[PDB]
Design a protein around this ligand. Structure first.
Ligand SMILES: O=c1c(Cc2ccccc2)c(O)nc2sc3cc(Cl)ccc3n12
Length: 448
């Protein structure tokens, strides 16, 4: 249902000719939901979530579409044929280059008007299968003809081609992003190249296996800052009544969470204590563009506040250019020996929309956070929150994970930004929201 390189007119004709009523598609415009008369519904994503006009806020475009197909009718997704966003698709490439690149089950489809399925087999050889394209459909020389190269690949992923002498041409996996640290050259090549690689990652949203059940419960709706933006049930924080919109991220561990609500302040301190977290990363202001993003869950400097069964002291506040650092002290009301310092690094210079022009400041912040975390024996996950706990939270954890690798291996390590994002998304959907953030992660790793 997502079409990466179409226009409003192309979409309008597609839905009128190849579609019916209830038929819909999505496309980059910022996104547009084109439904069939043909209506165009705007989707904006400045970095926190997908905000549909006259609709709701979502972690992914696929979560958005799944919700409106279940609850202007979204009934029939009008499928896209362009293979540009598929991992296996290389477009322009020769046989030799594909042979050398592939040098088991590893495949690709390359490019008169015809395509070539190059597959590796071993314990080795590279088999090239021609794909004829006649009157818009695709085929391997006989049998079934496919509406798109996608239908072809998925048909042969399930049903592999058998070579004359019994060789199974398995379609297992498509890696063109695992660059060695060195980054400078890759950033130049992706400079767009970044948007192309970003939407390939977006096309991998629905491959992820996750449930959102506990967050959809009656007793837990009030505990969600955005009703549709929910934690993954397999990695959610269970409080030992048990609910918080938070997930554990394990590549140093992190807890990705939303900005505190007035009714979730006590549950946030119950989580920090239980998890033995000593570092909080706040990547948002309490209020941005007149809307509240997170409530003040920490006392004023020198003050002491009781938050349910938890007691928090604000020892000292230390201002830096980009951030404030609050030395907090947490204990359970009743038992004195339960006390520990909790350090809250509150980044305040993040723009209301988009990303910082330079990642220097973010990189100084994360460096400080990392050394404060490494200075504490038996320390729990680093708590990271923004507004929804997916956009900024995701950009901060991904940059932190990748620089963690470059700290322990040096300028000689193999990094894969989209592979890291997909892995984090497997633990909380929507982690890293926009293409601008995606590019900022590359620029951050570059500047580091
Ligand atoms: O998806 C994966 C998986 C599989 C995977 C599944 C769950 C959690 C982590 C990893 C994998 O090993 N490697 C890569 S590289 C790559 C590039 C892009 Cl643009 C998009 C995806 C993608 N991708």
């Amino acid at each position: 249902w997502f079409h990466p390189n179409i226009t409003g007119v192309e979409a309008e004709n597609l839905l009128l000719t190849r579609g019916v009523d209830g038929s819909f598609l999505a496309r980059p415009s910022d996104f547009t939901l084109s439904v069939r008369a043909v209506t165009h519904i705007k989707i904006q994503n400045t970095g926190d979530y997908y905000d549909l006009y006259g609709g709701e806020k979502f972690a992914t475009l696929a979560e958005l579409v799944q919700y409106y197909m279940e609850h202007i009718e979204l009934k029939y997704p009008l499928n896209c044929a362009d293979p540009t966003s598929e991992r296996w698709f290389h477009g322009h490439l020769s046989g030799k280059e594909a042979e050398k690149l592939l040098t088991h089950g590893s495949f690709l489809v390359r490019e008169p008007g015809d395509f070539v399925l190059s597959v590796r087999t071993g314990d080795s050889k590279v088999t090239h299968v021609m794909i004829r394209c006649q009157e818009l459909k695709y085929d391997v020389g006989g049998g079934e003809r496919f509406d798109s190269l996608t239908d072809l690949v998925e048909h042969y992923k399930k049903n592999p081609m058998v070579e004359t002498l019994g060789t199974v041409l398995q379609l297992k996996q498509p890696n063109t992003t695992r660059i060695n640290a060195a980054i400078e050259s890759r950033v130049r090549e992706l400079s767009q190249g970044f948007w192309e690689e970003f939407e390939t990652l977006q096309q991998q949203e629905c491959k992820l296996l996750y449930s959102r059940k506990e967050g959809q419960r009656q007793e837990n709706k009030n505990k969600n800052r955005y009703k549709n933006i929910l934690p993954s049930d397999h990695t959610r924080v269970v409080l030992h009544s048990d609910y918080i919109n938070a997930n554990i991220i394990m590549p140093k561990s992190y807890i990705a969470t939303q900005g505190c609500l007035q009714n979730t302040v006590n549950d946030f301190w119950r989580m920090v204590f239980q998890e033995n977290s000593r570092v909080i990363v706040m990547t948002t202001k309490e209020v941005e563009r007149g809307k509240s993003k997170c409530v003040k869950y920490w006392p004023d400097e020198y003050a002491l506040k009781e938050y349910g069964v938890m007691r928090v002291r604000n020892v000292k506040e230390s201002a830096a250019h980009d951030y404030t650092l609050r030395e907090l002290k947490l204990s359970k009301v009743g038992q004195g020996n339960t006390e520990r310092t909790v350090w809250q690094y509150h980044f305040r210079t993040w723009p209301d929309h988009g990303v910082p022009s330079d990642p220097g400041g973010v990189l100084d912040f994360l460096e400080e956070v990392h050394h404060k975390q490494e200075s504490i024996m038996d320390a729990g996950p680093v708590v990271v929150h923004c507004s929804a706990g997916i956009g900024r939270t995701g950009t901060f954890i991904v940059i932190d994970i990748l620089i963690d690798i470059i700290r322990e291996k040096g300028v000689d390590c193999d990094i894969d930004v989209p592979k890291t994002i997909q892995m984090v998304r497997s633990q909380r959907s929507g982690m890293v929201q926009t293409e601008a953030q995606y590019r900022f992660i590359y620029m951050a790793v570059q500047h580091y």
